[PDB]
Amino acid sequence: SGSAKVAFSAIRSTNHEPSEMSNRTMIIYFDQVLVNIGNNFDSERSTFIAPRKGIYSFNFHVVKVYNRQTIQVSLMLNGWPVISAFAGDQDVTREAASNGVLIQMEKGDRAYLKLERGNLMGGWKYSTFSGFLVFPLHH
Amino acid sequence: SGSAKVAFSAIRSTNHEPSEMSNRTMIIYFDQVLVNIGNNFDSERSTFIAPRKGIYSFNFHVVKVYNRQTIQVSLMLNGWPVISAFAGDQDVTREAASNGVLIQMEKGDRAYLKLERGNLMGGWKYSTFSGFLVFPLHH
Amino acid sequence: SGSAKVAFSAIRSTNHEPSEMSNRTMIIYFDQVLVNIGNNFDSERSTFIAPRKGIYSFNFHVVKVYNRQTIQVSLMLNGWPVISAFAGDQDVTREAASNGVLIQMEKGDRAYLKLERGNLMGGWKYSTFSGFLVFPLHH
Numbered sequence: 120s121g122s123a124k125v126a127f128s129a130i131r132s133t134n135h136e137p138s139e140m141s142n143r144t145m146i147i148y149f150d151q152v153l154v155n156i157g158n159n160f161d162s163e164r165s166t167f168i169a170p171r172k173g174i175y176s177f178n179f180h181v182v183k184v185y186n187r188q189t190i191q192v193s194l195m196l197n198g199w200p201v202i203s204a205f206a207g208d209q210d211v212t213r214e215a216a217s218n219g220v221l222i223q224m225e226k227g228d229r230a231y232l233k234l235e236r237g238n239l240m241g242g243w244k245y246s247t248f249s250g251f252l253v254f255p256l257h258h
Numbered sequence: 259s260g261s262a263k264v265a266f267s268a269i270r271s272t273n274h275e276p277s278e279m280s281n282r283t284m285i286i287y288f289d290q291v292l293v294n295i296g297n298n299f300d301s302e303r304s305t306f307i308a309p310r311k312g313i314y315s316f317n318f319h320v321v322k323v324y325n326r327q328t329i330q331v332s333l334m335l336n337g338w339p340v341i342s343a344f345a346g347d348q349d350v351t352r353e354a355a356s357n358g359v360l361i362q363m364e365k366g367d368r369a370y371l372k373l374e375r376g377n378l379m380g381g382w383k384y385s386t387f388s389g390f391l392v393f394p395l396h397h
Numbered sequence: 398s399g400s401a402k403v404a405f406s407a408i409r410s411t412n413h414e415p416s417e418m419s420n421r422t423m424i425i426y427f428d429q430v431l432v433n434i435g436n437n438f439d440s441e442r443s444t445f446i447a448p449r450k451g452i453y454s455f456n457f458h459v460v461k462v463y464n465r466q467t468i469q470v471s472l473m474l475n476g477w478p479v480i481s482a483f484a485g486d487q488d489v490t491r492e493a494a495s496n497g498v499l500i501q502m503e504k505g506d507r508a509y510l511k512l513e514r515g516n517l518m519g520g521w522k523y524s525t526f527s528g529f530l531v532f533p534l535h536h
């Protein structure tokens with residue numbers, strides 16, 4: 120597929136608490152990048168930047184522990200929520216806010232996960248975020 | 259990929275209650291279509307109609323609120339359930355019946371989501387349904 | 398895509414209890430294979446064996462009933478967990494441990510689901526496991 124091979128996947132490998140900057144941006148950070156074909160995933164910002172016009176698939180599963188908060192996690196496209204997922208609060212099991220979607224992106228569009236409500240104190244180990252170009256679009 | 263570029267994604271953008279017809283069909287309706295490459299998703303019927311033989315990927319996340327019902331949501335292929343997902347009933351958080359699968363479809367096969375058990379009173383805002391042709395098949 | 402068309406999907410169609418061997422391996426078994434393009438999914442072992450170097454997408458949803466256990470399900474790559482999902486224990490609804498990810502695999506790498514914690518007594522009907530080659534890689 121040449122320059123139509125674009126894919127990333129990243130995970131949260133520890134239960135370490137959020138940083139001050141993560142608290143300010145509420146952008147969910149993934150420390151371990153498993154795939155980054157095209158180097159279009161910015162691992163410092165946990166943001167995917169589309170290299171070309173196309174249909175992109177995204178999936179995420181944000182895993183939380185008991186921390187007295189319910190959460191809403193949203194896939195953001197240029198600062199606007201496209202889809203959201205939800206998780207509650209209990210002390211029986213880790214639980215996940217999961218969702219996925221296909222979206223059209225232009226070159227330079229940015230996709231990332233934002234904690235719209237709640238916090239991730241206690242860590243978000245086992246959280247995952249991945250995406251790939253399904254096919255490019257011309258015009 | 260030419261005529262092998264087929265993709266759709268749709269979401270439920272409001273918490274409005276189901277219509278009379280939705281009550282009769284128990285087919286889950288998505289008011290906002292984000293992607294519809296090939297125009298193979300029938301937005302009036304929330305049904306994907308395969309344009310050609312191939313392997314198709316589908317994912318869904320049906321989000322419910324507290325409404326005194328648990329739900330079973332099934333991906334239907336020509337009126338038969340292929341996969342199902344489940345959600346409970348509580349008043350702490352929105353929660354989702356989520357699943358996904360790859361299936362082979364022939365031209366004219368129809369895929370849609372059906373509420374096999376329960377109801378979506380209180381709305382199903384944030385629900386998502388998407389799919390794409392992974393690759394075509396000949397013969 | 399020729400030999401770049403690789404895809405599988407399998408489901409658990411009954412609530413039958415795990416076998417002795419399933420108890421010993423804790424590898425989750427799927428009795429009904431819906432898709433197996435390339436015949437790279439070993440249905441006896443519920444293991445996908447990559448035919449070539451590439452980026453592969455995997456998704457799973459393991460559905461449990463009340464059985465006095467919480468579970469952790471992990472996607473294993475050559476015996477090492479890549480991603481995990483979690484489900485609790487209650488008697489209100491079936492519930493699912495769900496996650497998905499993209500990974501790079503070499504020819505001969507093996508991917509399967511393992512019950513890292515808990516059991517699936519009471520069955521795991523409606524569980525699903527699927528995957529496909531997103532694109533091949535050279536070198």
Ligand SMILES: *[C@@H]1O[C@H](CO)[C@@H](O[C@@H]2O[C@H](CO)[C@@H](O)[C@H](O)[C@H]2NC(C)=O)[C@H](O[C@@H]2O[C@@H](C)[C@@H](O)[C@@H](O)[C@@H]2O)[C@H]1NC(C)=O
Pocket residue numbers: 136137138139142238240
């Ligand atoms: C990120 O936000 C968290 C939620 O607001 C912070 O935790 C809160 O910290 C308050 C004092 O900074 C404390 O009164 C709150 O009870 C506490 N809330 C929760 C739910 O834990 C977190 O700050 C961390 O904890 C405090 C005690 C300090 O030691 C910080 O250095 C910790 O990181 C925030 N983390 C930051 C700003 O780095």
Ligand SMILES: *[C@@H]1O[C@H](CO)[C@@H](O[C@@H]2O[C@H](CO)[C@@H](O)[C@H](O)[C@H]2NC(C)=O)[C@H](O[C@@H]2O[C@@H](C)[C@@H](O)[C@@H](O)[C@@H]2O)[C@H]1NC(C)=O
Pocket residue numbers: 275276277278281377379
């Ligand atoms: C779609 O099905 C719902 C579940 O059967 C309907 O709600 C039910 O409406 C009954 C009277 O129509 C009422 O006795 C039940 O308590 C109620 N059940 C629940 C769980 O809310 C729904 O009807 C809506 O509510 C009633 C009161 C009417 O105003 C309808 O016009 C409402 O839509 C059904 N909606 C339809 C048929 O449009």
Ligand SMILES: *[C@@H]1O[C@H](CO)[C@@H](O[C@@H]2O[C@H](CO)[C@@H](O)[C@H](O)[C@H]2NC(C)=O)[C@H](O[C@@H]2O[C@@H](C)[C@@H](O)[C@@H](O)[C@@H]2O)[C@H]1NC(C)=O
Pocket residue numbers: 414415416417420516518
């Ligand atoms: C697979 O593992 C299960 C969990 O260890 C077994 O169930 C357990 O069986 C014990 C006796 O074998 C019994 O004391 C435990 O209470 C029971 N635990 C649970 C949670 O059910 C299961 O064995 C099944 O049940 C027993 C009674 C025998 O009839 C086996 O033939 C059953 O399969 C294990 N299944 C195997 C080894 O095939």
